[PDB]
Amino acid sequence: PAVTEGGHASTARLRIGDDQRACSGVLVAAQWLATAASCFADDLGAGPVAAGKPQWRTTAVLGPAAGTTVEVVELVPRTDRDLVLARLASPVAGTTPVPFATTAPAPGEELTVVGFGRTKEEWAPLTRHTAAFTVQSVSGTTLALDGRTDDDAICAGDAGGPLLRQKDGGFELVALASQSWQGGCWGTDPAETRNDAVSPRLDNIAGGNTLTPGAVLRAEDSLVSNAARLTLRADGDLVVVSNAGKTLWSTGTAGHLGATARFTDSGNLTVVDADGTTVLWESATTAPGGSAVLQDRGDLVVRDAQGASQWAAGTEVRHDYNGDGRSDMAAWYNYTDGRDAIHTFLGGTDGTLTKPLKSYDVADGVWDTRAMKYLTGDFNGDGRGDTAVLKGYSDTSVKLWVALGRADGGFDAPYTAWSTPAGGFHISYMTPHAGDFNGDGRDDVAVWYAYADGSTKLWTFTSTDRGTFNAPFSSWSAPSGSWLRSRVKSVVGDFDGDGRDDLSVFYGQGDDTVKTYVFPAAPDGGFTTPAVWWQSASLDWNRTTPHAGDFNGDGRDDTLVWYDYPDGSDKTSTMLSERVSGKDRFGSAKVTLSSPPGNLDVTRMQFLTGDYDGDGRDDLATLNHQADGTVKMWTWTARPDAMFNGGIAGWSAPASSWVFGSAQFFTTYPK
Amino acid sequence: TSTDRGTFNAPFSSWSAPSGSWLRSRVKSVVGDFDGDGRDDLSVFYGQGDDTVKTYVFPAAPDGGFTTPAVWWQSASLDWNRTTPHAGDFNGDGRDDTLVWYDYPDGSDKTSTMLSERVSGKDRFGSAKVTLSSPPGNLDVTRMQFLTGDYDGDGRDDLATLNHQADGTVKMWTWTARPDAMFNGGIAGWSAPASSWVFGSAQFFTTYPK
Numbered sequence: 077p078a079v080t081e082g083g084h085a086s087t088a089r090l091r092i093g094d095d096q097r098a099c100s101g102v103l104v105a106a107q108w109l110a111t112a113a114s115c116f117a118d119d120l121g122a123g124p125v126a127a128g129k130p131q132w133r134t135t136a137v138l139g140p141a142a143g144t145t146v147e148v149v150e151l152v153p154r155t156d157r158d159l160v161l162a163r164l165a166s167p168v169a170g171t172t173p174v175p176f177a178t179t180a181p182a183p184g185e186e187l188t189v190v191g192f193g194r195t196k197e198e199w200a201p202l203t204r205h206t207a208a209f210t211v212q213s214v215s216g217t218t219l220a221l222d223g224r225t226d227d228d229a230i231c232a233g234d235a236g237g238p239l240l241r242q243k244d245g246g247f248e249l250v251a252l253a254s255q256s257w258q259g260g261c262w263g264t265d266p267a268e269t270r271n272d273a274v275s276p277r278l279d280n281i282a283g284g285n286t287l288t289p290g291a292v293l294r295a296e297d298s299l300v301s302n303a304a305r306l307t308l309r310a311d312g313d314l315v316v317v318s319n320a321g322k323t324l325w326s327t328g329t330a331g332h333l334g335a336t337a338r339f340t341d342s343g344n345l346t347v348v349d350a351d352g353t354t355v356l357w358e359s360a361t362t363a364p365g366g367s368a369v370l371q372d373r374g375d376l377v378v379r380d381a382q383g384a385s386q387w388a389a390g391t392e393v394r395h396d397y398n399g400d401g402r403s404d405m406a407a408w409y410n411y412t413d414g415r416d417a418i419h420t421f422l423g424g425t426d427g428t429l430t431k432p433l434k435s436y437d438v439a440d441g442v443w444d445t446r447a448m449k450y451l452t453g454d455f456n457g458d459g460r461g462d463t464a465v466l467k468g469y470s471d472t473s474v475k476l477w478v479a480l481g482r483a484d485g486g487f488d489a490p491y492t493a494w495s496t497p498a499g500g501f502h503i504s505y506m507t508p509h510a511g512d513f514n515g516d517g518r519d520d521v522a523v524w525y526a527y528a529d530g531s532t533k534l535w536t537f538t539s540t541d542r543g544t545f546n547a548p549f550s551s552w553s554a555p556s557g558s559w560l561r562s563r564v565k566s567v568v569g570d571f572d573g574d575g576r577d578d579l580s581v582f583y584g585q586g587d588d589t590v591k592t593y594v595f596p597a598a599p600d601g602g603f604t605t606p607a608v609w610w611q612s613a614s615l616d617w618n619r620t621t622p623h624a625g626d627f628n629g630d631g632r633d634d635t636l637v638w639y640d641y642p643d644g645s646d647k648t649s650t651m652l653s654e655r656v657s658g659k660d661r662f663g664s665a666k667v668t669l670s671s672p673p674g675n676l677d678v679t680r681m682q683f684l685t686g687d688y689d690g691d692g693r694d695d696l697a698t699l700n701h702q703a704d705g706t707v708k709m710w711t712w713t714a715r716p717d718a719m720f721n722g723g724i725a726g727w728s729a730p731a732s733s734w735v736f737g738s739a740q741f742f743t744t745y746p747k
Numbered sequence: 748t749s750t751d752r753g754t755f756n757a758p759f760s761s762w763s764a765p766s767g768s769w770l771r772s773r774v775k776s777v778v779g780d781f782d783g784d785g786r787d788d789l790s791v792f793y794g795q796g797d798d799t800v801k802t803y804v805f806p807a808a809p810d811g812g813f814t815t816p817a818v819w820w821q822s823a824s825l826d827w828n829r830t831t832p833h834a835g836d837f838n839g840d841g842r843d844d845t846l847v848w849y850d851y852p853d854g855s856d857k858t859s860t861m862l863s864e865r866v867s868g869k870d871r872f873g874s875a876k877v878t879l880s881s882p883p884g885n886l887d888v889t890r891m892q893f894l895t896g897d898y899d900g901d902g903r904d905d906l907a908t909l910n911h912q913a914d915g916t917v918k919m920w921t922w923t924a925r926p927d928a929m930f931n932g933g934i935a936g937w938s939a940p941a942s943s944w945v946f947g948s949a950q951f952f953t954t955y956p957k
């Protein structure tokens with residue numbers, strides 16, 4: 077029988093190659109499908125499936141009227157089941173994924189079989205058809221299934237189709253169709269009347285993006301999200317990989333075959349050996365009643381019962397605009413004719429930056445670009461970076477604009493995410509910072525507001541699931557005569573790896589010495605009393621330009637200082653974050669980059685950090701204005717020891733095309 | 748320099764380098780008399796960008812200062828970040844030479860000895876050979892302190908360590924040197940529980956840092 081339109085929208089049809097093979101599957105996550113492995117095998121119906129890109133260009137069609145078409149990019153097959161998870165080029169909107177069953181199937185249970193395979197009469201139906209199956213037995217990694225009646229059957233081309241169990245008006249995923257006698261099916265000898273079938277069980281595997289207390293993640297298993305995958309390898313090594321196919325984080329527990337990863341009732345996440353007793357790795361957290369969740373934003377975070385982050389792996393790519401697993405950068409370009417547009421430079425596989433593409437090109441008079449500040453970050457929880465603009469208006473009012481990132485690397489039209497009547501906030505006093513301060517899986521905005529009376533307050537604008545911002549609230553504050561705005565150079569990042577971004581300030585201490593404060597983020601998104609993590613009198617504050625990022629892949633961010641020497645030369649000193657004797661601080665500074673005198677002018681180039689080659693370690697790239705007016709991109713990648721490599725040249729242009737002083741890059745912290 | 752009163756004179760400089768040349772963070776230094784001229788001098792195992800190892804020697808001037816360095820040994824087969832150089836006369840030549848303790852990714856470690864020699868009038872270190880090796884997991888290079896010297900007084904320098912064991916016990920080991928600069932098996936010496944000697948709370952008097 078045919079399925080009523082709008083039903084089982086989560087059920088997808090797959091087309092492999094140039095109509096070479098037919099296969100079915102089900103939506104499991106916004107950007108993931110679950111399909112049969114046998115249809116992607118070199119030998120159809122049996123044998124191994126290649127990991128990574130499929131052997132043939134493959135697409136899938138799904139939705140209530142099968143009106144949505146998406147491409148499958150990457151396969152990660154399982155070895156003990158006819159099951160492969162396929163990553164999509166883009167997430168599917170408007171279609172709800174099917175959750176995994178949390179209980180075992182049992183004999184006598186009725187399962188609903190739906191797919192796009194051949195029917196009793198139709199070789200290649202244009203709609204979904206279903207069948208009623210009953211469980212006969214459950215063992216190993218498969219189910220023994222038969223028909224509820226002798227009228228229907230599972231037929232060729234329907235492989236990979238979901239077998240659903242109805243519960244509370246909804247459905248749960250129990251198994252995918254695999255092999256059968258296909259009795260009574262079109263194109264099959266009528267002599268065969270059996271509809272007995274065997275399918276892999278999907279109830280005894282990890283799924284979704286969360287681990288509950290007591291949950292166990294078996295080897296050759298994984299959790300998935302839009303911008304990351306968490307998997308435990310057969311060799312016992314628990315790893316997280318990006319959409320680029322590269323590993324961002326690992327426990328390093330390789331060679332311990334049979335090792336298992338589990339989330340304990342104590343709230344910690346650990347890796348245990350084959351003996352079920354010996355611990356090979358632990359997050360060493362405490363959070364009873366908590367859970368471990370792999371976010372769409374990118375990273376893996378362990379949260380307590382109150383929803384507060386306790387620990388994070390830090391497996392994220394900052395301002396990745398297309399979601400391809402590598403950091404990008406973008407700029408707001410003001411043309412001399414009054415019009416403006418946003419240009420995006422995508423990261424390449426070698427860490428270089430490709431030629432920019434433009435988007436959101438608007439006419440003169442649309443924006444009054446005299447008093448605006450630019451922010452970047454993922455403000456929707458998409459898994460791809462967005463942008464935002466904080467702008468003042470001639471009536472003294474303020475608005476905060478947000479533009480969502482597109483899959484093609486461009487941006488959509490900005491929309492107002494927050495606004496205030498004049499007399500509330502003033503653009504001249506606000507100093508916004510982007511990052512995830514709340515730890516809710518969406519970036520938000522913090523403002524260091526300097527009052528005319530000399531007082532200071534930190535305001536936080538948390539993000540909603542609508543992409544909009546809530547009303548600002550204050551937390552940390554200081555009396556007038558204490559903190560001076562003119563002496564504050566601020567950066568942001570997650571400096572202790574607690575899953576929440578926070579502030580740090582390089583303060584000019586009277587004699588132009590440098591003292592670094594950190595302002596840890598509260599569970600409520602606010603900020604706590606600062607403490608000093610680093611200080612030095614060996615360097616002049618007026619010549620320091622601090623930057624933040626994870627420059628050794630620790631999972632916790634740290635800082636470097638670009639220093640402009642009187643000699644005409646410059647260098648970067650990196651201070652890695654570490655905890656010693658229970659005390660958090662930055663370690664001793666070392667020179668990681670240096671140039672000859674006169675080789676670079678710090679006032680003629682714009683800086684932006686990020687993970688450009690997607691190797692899990694943050695690095696920095698610049699657009700520098702050369703003596704002849706030429707603008708050139710350089711990227712210095714980070715070595716495992718936080719030493720930088722030589723700069724790699726990327727896109728460049730004459731001043732006749734790109735004017736240096738007329739463009740501003742979207743950043744995470746000002747200057 | 749030292750006086751006959753046991754006191755030191757005012758310091759004076761000799762060799763120097765401009766900024767942007769030698770980076771302190773990439774310098775692992777040892778000292779000894781590497782050409783047998785009767786004066787001790789410096790040598791540096793420098794991390795050459797890609798973490799390869801290049802060894803410089805800084806011969807001592809008659810006035811106690813140091814002269815322009817020259818390269819005595821280089822190899823790209825070993826990772827600088829895993830090398831801990833030591834100096835001494837490990838074959839009784841009368842002129843000091845160096846060995847490198849190497850911490851492998853495999854969990855094992857070894858010592859490679861490069862004996863000092865003069866060939867065609869040119870001073871350099873000879874080809875490296877493995878003189879000591881251990882099973883994987885047998886020793887942790889970050890849990891033990893090293894010190895070289897001639898412990899049995901046979902004229903050939905050798906090395907001994909105080910290693911911190913998994914159970915907190917601290918144990919002394921000495922590996923004596925054979926005439927061919929091969930090491931013998933380690934000989935156990937004094938040992939104690941952590942309740943008596945705390946490993947991380949004691950520092951040995953050395954001739955060169957780390």
Ligand SMILES: CC(=O)N[C@@H]1[C@H](O[C@H]2[C@@H](O)[C@@H](CO)O[C@H](O)[C@@H]2NC(C)=O)O[C@H](C(=O)O)[C@@H](O[C@H]2O[C@H](CO)[C@H](O)[C@H](O)[C@H]2NC(C)=O)[C@@H]1NC(C)=O
Binds near residue numbers: 447470471472503504
């Ligand atoms: C003249 C002056 O002091 N203007 C104030 C402020 O000056 C700074 C500041 O904008 C920073 C950061 O944006 O950039 C430069 O350092 C500016 N310096 C100079 C010399 O221009 O600029 C703001 C501003 O919004 O540019 C002024 O506020 C005014 O402009 C806004 C936006 O266009 C709007 O037009 C307001 O009506 C106008 N505000 C007032 C009160 O006249 C700052 N003004 C004051 C009075 O503090």
